[PDB]
Design a protein around this ligand. Sequence first.
Ligand SMILES: *[C@@H]1O[C@H](CO)[C@@H](O[C@@H]2O[C@H](CO)[C@@H](O[C@@H]3O[C@H](CO[C@H]4O[C@H](CO)[C@@H](O)[C@H](O)[C@@H]4O)[C@@H](O)[C@H](O[C@H]4O[C@H](CO)[C@@H](O)[C@H](O)[C@@H]4O)[C@@H]3O)[C@H](O)[C@H]2NC(C)=O)[C@H](O)[C@H]1NC(C)=O
Ligand SMILES: *[C@@H]1O[C@H](CO)[C@@H](O[C@@H]2O[C@H](CO)[C@@H](O[C@@H]3O[C@H](CO[C@H]4O[C@H](CO)[C@@H](O)[C@H](O)[C@@H]4O)[C@@H](O)[C@H](O[C@H]4O[C@H](CO)[C@@H](O)[C@H](O)[C@@H]4O)[C@@H]3O)[C@H](O)[C@H]2NC(C)=O)[C@H](O)[C@H]1NC(C)=O
Ligand SMILES: *[C@@H]1O[C@H](CO)[C@@H](O[C@@H]2O[C@H](CO)[C@@H](O[C@@H]3O[C@H](CO)[C@@H](O)[C@H](O)[C@@H]3O)[C@H](O)[C@H]2NC(C)=O)[C@H](O)[C@H]1NC(C)=O
Ligand SMILES: *[C@@H]1O[C@H](CO)[C@@H](O[C@@H]2O[C@H](CO)[C@@H](O[C@@H]3O[C@H](CO)[C@@H](O)[C@H](O)[C@@H]3O)[C@H](O)[C@H]2NC(C)=O)[C@H](O)[C@H]1NC(C)=O
Ligand SMILES: *[C@@H]1O[C@H](CO)[C@@H](O[C@@H]2O[C@H](CO)[C@@H](O)[C@H](O)[C@H]2NC(C)=O)[C@H](O)[C@H]1NC(C)=O
Ligand SMILES: *[C@@H]1O[C@H](CO)[C@@H](O[C@@H]2O[C@H](CO)[C@@H](O)[C@H](O)[C@H]2NC(C)=O)[C@H](O)[C@H]1NC(C)=O
Ligand SMILES: *[C@@H]1O[C@H](CO)[C@@H](O[C@@H]2O[C@H](CO)[C@@H](O)[C@H](O)[C@H]2NC(C)=O)[C@H](O)[C@H]1NC(C)=O
Ligand SMILES: *[C@@H]1O[C@H](CO)[C@@H](O[C@@H]2O[C@H](CO)[C@@H](O)[C@H](O)[C@H]2NC(C)=O)[C@H](O)[C@H]1NC(C)=O
Ligand SMILES: *[C@@H]1O[C@H](CO)[C@@H](O[C@@H]2O[C@H](CO)[C@@H](O)[C@H](O)[C@H]2NC(C)=O)[C@H](O)[C@H]1NC(C)=O
Ligand SMILES: *[C@@H]1O[C@H](CO)[C@@H](O[C@@H]2O[C@H](CO)[C@@H](O)[C@H](O)[C@H]2NC(C)=O)[C@H](O)[C@H]1NC(C)=O
Ligand SMILES: *[C@@H]1O[C@H](CO)[C@@H](O)[C@H](O)[C@H]1NC(C)=O
Ligand SMILES: *[C@@H]1O[C@H](CO)[C@@H](O)[C@H](O)[C@H]1NC(C)=O
Ligand SMILES: *[C@@H]1O[C@H](CO)[C@@H](O)[C@H](O)[C@H]1NC(C)=O
Ligand SMILES: *[C@@H]1O[C@H](CO)[C@@H](O)[C@H](O)[C@H]1NC(C)=O
Ligand SMILES: [Ca+2]
Ligand SMILES: [Ca+2]
Ligand SMILES: [Cl-]
Ligand SMILES: [Cl-]
Ligand SMILES: [Zn+2]
Ligand SMILES: [Zn+2]
Ligand SMILES: [Zn+2]
Ligand SMILES: [Zn+2]
Lengths: 695, 695
Amino acid sequence: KHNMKAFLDELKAENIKKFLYNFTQIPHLAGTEQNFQLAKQIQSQWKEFGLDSVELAHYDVLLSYPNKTHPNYISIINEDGNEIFNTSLFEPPPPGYENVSDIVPPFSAFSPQGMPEGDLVYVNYARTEDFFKLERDMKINCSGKIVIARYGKVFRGNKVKNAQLAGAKGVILYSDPADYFAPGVKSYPDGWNLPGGGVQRGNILNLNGAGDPLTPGYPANEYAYRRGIAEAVGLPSIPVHPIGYYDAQKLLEKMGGSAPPDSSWRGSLKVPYNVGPGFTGNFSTQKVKMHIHSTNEVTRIYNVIGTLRGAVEPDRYVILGGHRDSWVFGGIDPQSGAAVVHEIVRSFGTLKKEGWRPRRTILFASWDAEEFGLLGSTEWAEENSRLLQERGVAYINADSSIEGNYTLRVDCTPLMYSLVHNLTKELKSPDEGFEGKSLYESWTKKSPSPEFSGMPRISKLGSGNDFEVFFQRLGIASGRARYTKNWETNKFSGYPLYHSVYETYELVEKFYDPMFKYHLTVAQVRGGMVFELANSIVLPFDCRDYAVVLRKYADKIYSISMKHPQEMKTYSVSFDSLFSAVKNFTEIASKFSERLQDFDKNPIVLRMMNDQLMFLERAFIDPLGLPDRPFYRHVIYAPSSHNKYAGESFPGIYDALFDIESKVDPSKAWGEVKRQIYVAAFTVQAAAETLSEVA
Amino acid sequence: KHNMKAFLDELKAENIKKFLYNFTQIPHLAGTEQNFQLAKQIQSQWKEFGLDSVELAHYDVLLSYPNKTHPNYISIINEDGNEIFNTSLFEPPPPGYENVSDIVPPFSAFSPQGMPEGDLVYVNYARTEDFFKLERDMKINCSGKIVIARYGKVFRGNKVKNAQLAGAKGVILYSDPADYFAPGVKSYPDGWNLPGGGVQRGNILNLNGAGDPLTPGYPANEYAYRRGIAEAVGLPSIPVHPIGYYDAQKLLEKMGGSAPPDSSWRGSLKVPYNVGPGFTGNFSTQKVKMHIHSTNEVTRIYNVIGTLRGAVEPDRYVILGGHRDSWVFGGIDPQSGAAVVHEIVRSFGTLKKEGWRPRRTILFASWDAEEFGLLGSTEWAEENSRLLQERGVAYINADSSIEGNYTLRVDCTPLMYSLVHNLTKELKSPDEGFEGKSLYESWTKKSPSPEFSGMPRISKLGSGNDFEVFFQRLGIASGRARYTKNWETNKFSGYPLYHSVYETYELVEKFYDPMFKYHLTVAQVRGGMVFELANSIVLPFDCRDYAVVLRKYADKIYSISMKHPQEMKTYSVSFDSLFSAVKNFTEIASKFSERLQDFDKNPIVLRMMNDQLMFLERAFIDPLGLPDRPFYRHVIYAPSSHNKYAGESFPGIYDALFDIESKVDPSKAWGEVKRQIYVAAFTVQAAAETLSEVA
Ligand SMILES: *[C@@H]1O[C@H](CO)[C@@H](O[C@@H]2O[C@H](CO)[C@@H](O[C@@H]3O[C@H](CO[C@H]4O[C@H](CO)[C@@H](O)[C@H](O)[C@@H]4O)[C@@H](O)[C@H](O[C@H]4O[C@H](CO)[C@@H](O)[C@H](O)[C@@H]4O)[C@@H]3O)[C@H](O)[C@H]2NC(C)=O)[C@H](O)[C@H]1NC(C)=O
Ligand SMILES: *[C@@H]1O[C@H](CO)[C@@H](O[C@@H]2O[C@H](CO)[C@@H](O[C@@H]3O[C@H](CO[C@H]4O[C@H](CO)[C@@H](O)[C@H](O)[C@@H]4O)[C@@H](O)[C@H](O[C@H]4O[C@H](CO)[C@@H](O)[C@H](O)[C@@H]4O)[C@@H]3O)[C@H](O)[C@H]2NC(C)=O)[C@H](O)[C@H]1NC(C)=O
Ligand SMILES: *[C@@H]1O[C@H](CO)[C@@H](O[C@@H]2O[C@H](CO)[C@@H](O[C@@H]3O[C@H](CO)[C@@H](O)[C@H](O)[C@@H]3O)[C@H](O)[C@H]2NC(C)=O)[C@H](O)[C@H]1NC(C)=O
Ligand SMILES: *[C@@H]1O[C@H](CO)[C@@H](O[C@@H]2O[C@H](CO)[C@@H](O[C@@H]3O[C@H](CO)[C@@H](O)[C@H](O)[C@@H]3O)[C@H](O)[C@H]2NC(C)=O)[C@H](O)[C@H]1NC(C)=O
Ligand SMILES: *[C@@H]1O[C@H](CO)[C@@H](O[C@@H]2O[C@H](CO)[C@@H](O)[C@H](O)[C@H]2NC(C)=O)[C@H](O)[C@H]1NC(C)=O
Ligand SMILES: *[C@@H]1O[C@H](CO)[C@@H](O[C@@H]2O[C@H](CO)[C@@H](O)[C@H](O)[C@H]2NC(C)=O)[C@H](O)[C@H]1NC(C)=O
Ligand SMILES: *[C@@H]1O[C@H](CO)[C@@H](O[C@@H]2O[C@H](CO)[C@@H](O)[C@H](O)[C@H]2NC(C)=O)[C@H](O)[C@H]1NC(C)=O
Ligand SMILES: *[C@@H]1O[C@H](CO)[C@@H](O[C@@H]2O[C@H](CO)[C@@H](O)[C@H](O)[C@H]2NC(C)=O)[C@H](O)[C@H]1NC(C)=O
Ligand SMILES: *[C@@H]1O[C@H](CO)[C@@H](O[C@@H]2O[C@H](CO)[C@@H](O)[C@H](O)[C@H]2NC(C)=O)[C@H](O)[C@H]1NC(C)=O
Ligand SMILES: *[C@@H]1O[C@H](CO)[C@@H](O[C@@H]2O[C@H](CO)[C@@H](O)[C@H](O)[C@H]2NC(C)=O)[C@H](O)[C@H]1NC(C)=O
Ligand SMILES: *[C@@H]1O[C@H](CO)[C@@H](O)[C@H](O)[C@H]1NC(C)=O
Ligand SMILES: *[C@@H]1O[C@H](CO)[C@@H](O)[C@H](O)[C@H]1NC(C)=O
Ligand SMILES: *[C@@H]1O[C@H](CO)[C@@H](O)[C@H](O)[C@H]1NC(C)=O
Ligand SMILES: *[C@@H]1O[C@H](CO)[C@@H](O)[C@H](O)[C@H]1NC(C)=O
Ligand SMILES: [Ca+2]
Ligand SMILES: [Ca+2]
Ligand SMILES: [Cl-]
Ligand SMILES: [Cl-]
Ligand SMILES: [Zn+2]
Ligand SMILES: [Zn+2]
Ligand SMILES: [Zn+2]
Ligand SMILES: [Zn+2]
């Protein structure tokens, strides 16, 4: 047979290993020649594997690179102006790579240039609440100061935005061992920990879904009209640079001023974690000085787009996409994912050569410039938005396949919950001690949902990856899956070697997945989802699962509001309309489910009902967007305004309620809460009504 | 057979006459009890005629009404402050209606309240170019003046916006006999001319597609959150009132200051048409004073929605809609249209009772509050936007069936040109001297297109009617058709009795269409279009007709730019990308047309190709809208920024070029021209690509 088992059995761990090795011997930084060569390689192989067409889609977008002859660094500078301590110019290269060229040194992509000099303030993780604590409780003023923040907890772009609004004139980011050195594990090369010379690269934009900073709304093609830099989207206004913990120790050890307010502010280095401003007594006239010379430059990027045309519904697209560009070697991020996509393409192409085609069209994507702001995925979606809006069934992401070795992680739309539960029940667990058991069984046992027992955890989609345009701009049902670490011990730092030179093929082969079994399990989950999406006669979405979570989110947002019972009385703030809409959605979805089971098993009734399923995620889009974030159009889910990686439910109401007890005009503030309640209730009801009988 | 002939032959002129009489005996002003009663009547009859469901859809929207105990009027006031002349409090009622209650007196809907007093300036038609002439050439300053303008040429809302931006503190609108008294024809009741006591009602909003001023984006349902008045969309900031030409003669006869600049400024009254400011010598200390006391009030409105479910594609909607609310009796506007819709429903329901159903679902609409800003149509579309976006095949409007008796008028999307030509070739002409000839033949002879010879004129859609939400917001293929007057003699004033108390059943029966034959012809055209749209196996749209007009519009906009050859050199302004896109659209549309003829006559290939046809109008929508007009989202067609009734092609580029030689920063101005060229070329190319093979 050519069925899902045939597809799944063709997948090989050894192939994934070979591809991973192949993709990780040299850097593949976005906009570089090496990453164009790899694009061409992938294009050629996907043709050989059997896809019907494989093309490159290119764009010219704003990228950022350090100046090779004028290095970035930070100093401590004395009264005379001598630089008495300098941070490192590069990470010590790992064993066997010390002769590799074109390793980009640590930098914060999109930093403006500058040489600010001043007194330090330590701001913990530079979260919204960290700045609240500093300003409101401790009375420390960051205006004109250089802030130093530890990586962790939230997206670094949010940190930089928060520092800027506090009046900082610069930001130093560092990796604390509290967050990036796991107990009892050795530093790379002898284990998977971050050494003291290691540094996490990454961009510091606040794009809010825009894509290329210069062309919001439209693809950065050959005739594009570009904004000037000063009107560009999401660029930081102060210089920023990242360092490792050996260097951070030297900048922190002399700090004076106030003590840390409590222990959640102290990391693991042998320093007091004083907040400042400035250094203690003897050193009070010393200062910190940054030297940032990076440049932003419009640069060509290349996506690879592969098509396997559907036999029955070629105008229905199921997309498997993940990025190809890396900061350095990309041993985990993204090549552990890219190798899994490569093997999935190979397995689908094996079936194709034996005469099979899926029911619907499958598109495969190797995106560029993910690391610079989801640029490649977003420009392509901008170009193809009309096709995607009207024909997009589902997007499955495929970045890193592993960030740990403990259990499965899935984040997806409620529409895919049933599909994931069913598929995982049919796959074998790779976990020690669950031999001969299902993946569902191990997953549920190691990662219990915080709601249902006998069920596994499935998280909301947040952002910080290439599904953002598809899900939160365009409203296409999306999901992602990988192997992850223990949620119990998850400090929301990411894995220690994230975006460092130490993220290599050897890291993976020696410490994460020697047998490539977790990779194979993730290939089965991603590939299995694509298979079912592209081949099931009825789309495998259960609208009743959305009804259940909408009730949970409505309870949650109501609970937040109810912290302010006096204002809800004064301003007549009711959630009754939202609850009504959720009740109606629940009722209508139940009836639709009955019809979908009882209908005359009539292709037009079938195509009608498949369109109702396909357009249900679509219905949650508001064409006006969310307030001041036009490209976040989904009403139920947006990236958190405080942390791009985290998803927020009923974001418009959430942000209207946030810190509302501090607004100077409560009438206006509670008016906007009511406004957002109306928008949400309306959108829920409208989405429900797409599932009613059509006439 | 149950075919189009069966449908068409069932239509009766005598029925249209009976319905017209029935709908025009009492006023049906929006928001009044009488118009709710008529809604209920229509609902009951459409059920009896055989539709599957007929429901009322209600909204609470901002309406405007004079104060019954505090009448609006204008005075000339002397040095002491005595009102020596007052305009009329009402139009003399026509014969036999002098005892009818609830005739709303002449007023400008949405005027703010006020009693401004000042000197008059006469501003011709209050067009953009009229104000240019006044300010730039004549050096006359309108600041703090009351302006008096003749109706005609452009939508009255544009007049009021233009007066406000010139600094006026009030506006008086009047009907000049030059524009509303046809040579050799008697005043009502003895002919179809405007008497001197007649006055044209109408709203003066600038909504730019928003619908209800208080709820832009969302339906004005029971839980809607409403903007405060000061944040409302499109309300005028100065008082405004309309008068007839007996009264206007008394306000104009004393005008002094400058002479009219040329004869295009002089109407037909026996006055000099001096521009002012103020009155001549003896009267120089006299002033004009307005007294406006109308109020804006949220009021319930009622749309009637009827459904005739499709047998094969019930999830595909072909909509026939027109409004039911009238200023007074609505003998022409809208009841000549509403009666035609009523008879179309009756004929379709006759076929249904004999067991027939159309292929696709037909929706019939009786909209409310059209006269107050397309409110009823727009609120319903806001509510149902997701269903309409994904399922809307076509919208056919059905306001007034007649505005003359000379020939057919059609304004529609290029996608319907072929459909209209073909249908009209099969219908009989009602025209004297074309007995036994086709409607196509008479139409083409009396209204030659200004492009093709052997072809009839078909105009672009403008606005000022209920198709606006469907076409320019949502991108659903739309059209309209009526009988009209001679284009040779068309001064763009509208018919003389427009929005007056004299627009009665008798006007129509005695002077426009005694035999109801023009009404029957328009019922055949509107109903025939609906029939073909809802029943043709392949949708009856020809994408090649869009290609031809896109080239014409690109030539036109390029020609406008080329008035500025030096700036196009300085700023490197090229239309090459637009021309390229139009060429590609032409090529791709040609191939698609081949496939549509050659395809395997396979329902999925059929539903795929019908979806490509349905979503082609959709593809011209930009979700970001046009500059400062978020609800005008179609890139090819928008209502003119200078005249809501007129359509503009490539509006974003047009407005970027308009009066550009007067902008103070030409670099910036020409930058935005280039930006709009990019947006247009991109949208044309993207629309083309929806017609490529799908995979
Ligand atoms: C969840 O789904 C339910 C349906 O099961 C929706 O229920 C509707 O709720 C609205 C708001 O409460 C009801 O609105 C009321 O409609 C009355 C007239 O309804 C009749 O006529 C209409 C046609 O115009 C028919 O469609 C309808 O079926 C009924 O035959 C009005 O008279 C009411 O207004 C009066 O009371 C209100 C409230 O006190 C006053 O403010 C007004 O001034 C006025 O006095 C009112 O507008 C509606 O009838 C219900 N529909 C149905 C089919 O039952 C919920 O709305 C939905 N939830 C959400 C969030 O959409
Ligand atoms: C009307 O439809 C036609 C197609 O028939 C479109 O033609 C495209 O036009 C663009 C812009 O001119 C061409 O862009 C050029 O692409 C070159 C690479 O193309 C090859 O590789 C790509 C994959 O990346 C393939 O898809 C493609 O088929 C080719 O194999 C680039 O090298 C060019 O850039 C170089 O020259 C330019 C111009 O001087 C410089 O600015 C650059 O710096 C660089 O040196 C260029 O980007 C494209 O190849 C054409 N496509 C095809 C299929 O022929 C029109 O674009 C379309 N009109 C509109 C408005 O969309
Ligand atoms: C995940 O798998 C579950 C369990 O197999 C699937 O649910 C099952 O779906 C089938 C097929 O529609 C249901 O069968 C139907 O039962 C009704 C009940 O009367 C009958 O009338 C129909 O003709 C048909 O036989 C079955 O009831 C249902 N089981 C449960 C517990 O819900 C589910 O659909 C899968 N999900 C996805 C997305 O595929
Ligand atoms: C308006 O009517 C015209 C004239 O009837 C319709 O155009 C005609 O459409 C038919 C049906 O598709 C075409 O027939 C086809 O001809 C090709 C030519 O080789 C053949 O391969 C097909 O199998 C089929 O027989 C016909 O050529 C065409 N005539 C012309 C002059 O274009 C037109 O489609 C009608 N428009 C609408 C919207 O209905
Ligand atoms: C990654 O694998 C590819 C494909 O096997 C290798 O590229 C091929 O290299 C051979 C030998 O130089 C050439 O003959 C082929 O033309 C290449 N094929 C393609 C499609 O590019 C590549 O060398 C491998 N890279 C590494 C570092 O092992
Ligand atoms: C930190 O790096 C800086 C810059 O390279 C060093 O300062 C320079 O020292 C050279 C050689 O002594 C002088 O000629 C330059 O004028 C100095 N430049 C600046 C900007 O100060 C500094 O010595 C280094 N500090 C340490 C501790 O290594
Ligand atoms: C791979 O899995 C092993 C086994 O679970 C992990 O090692 C254990 O880590 C936990 C701490 O979380 C300790 O409780 C155990 O004592 C460790 N056992 C051994 C044998 O080392 C290891 O951490 C995993 N690798 C990665 C990269 O996460
Ligand atoms: C317009 O026509 C309608 C329908 O024929 C008339 O309304 C009917 O009036 C009769 C007599 O009063 C009643 O028995 C029916 O219940 C009414 N039907 C409906 C559906 O409303 C109406 O009277 C006519 N109006 C005028 C001015 O002639
Ligand atoms: C125009 O109408 C106004 C207002 O009704 C008339 O002025 C009023 O005249 C009455 C009776 O003489 C006075 O008691 C009021 O005080 C006046 N009101 C105002 C606002 O002036 C005026 O007479 C009318 N003019 C003409 C020519 O008929
Ligand atoms: C109905 O049609 C008649 C006949 O065309 C119109 O009357 C003619 O109007 C034109 C002026 O446009 C004159 O050239 C003719 O001399 C008129 N003839 C007659 C017999 O009156 C009439 O104007 C039309 N009615 C309406 C409302 O437009
Ligand atoms: C890099 O720095 C050098 C010298 O320090 C300078 O001359 C050059 O212009 C800079 N390059 C860029 C791209 O900014
Ligand atoms: C913070 O410091 C800056 C530095 O001059 C000052 O301008 C600003 O007002 C200060 N804010 C507070 C709350 O002290
Ligand atoms: C209408 O005018 C009267 C008296 O001239 C005033 O008392 C009343 O409030 C006004 N009505 C409205 C609705 O404004
Ligand atoms: C028009 O008149 C007003 C009235 O005071 C004045 O403020 C404005 O500047 C004048 N503009 C010109 C161009 O004279
Ligand atoms: Ca872009
Ligand atoms: Ca609204
Ligand atoms: Cl992922
Ligand atoms: Cl019309
Ligand atoms: Zn990544
Ligand atoms: Zn990354
Ligand atoms: Zn009308
Ligand atoms: Zn009207």
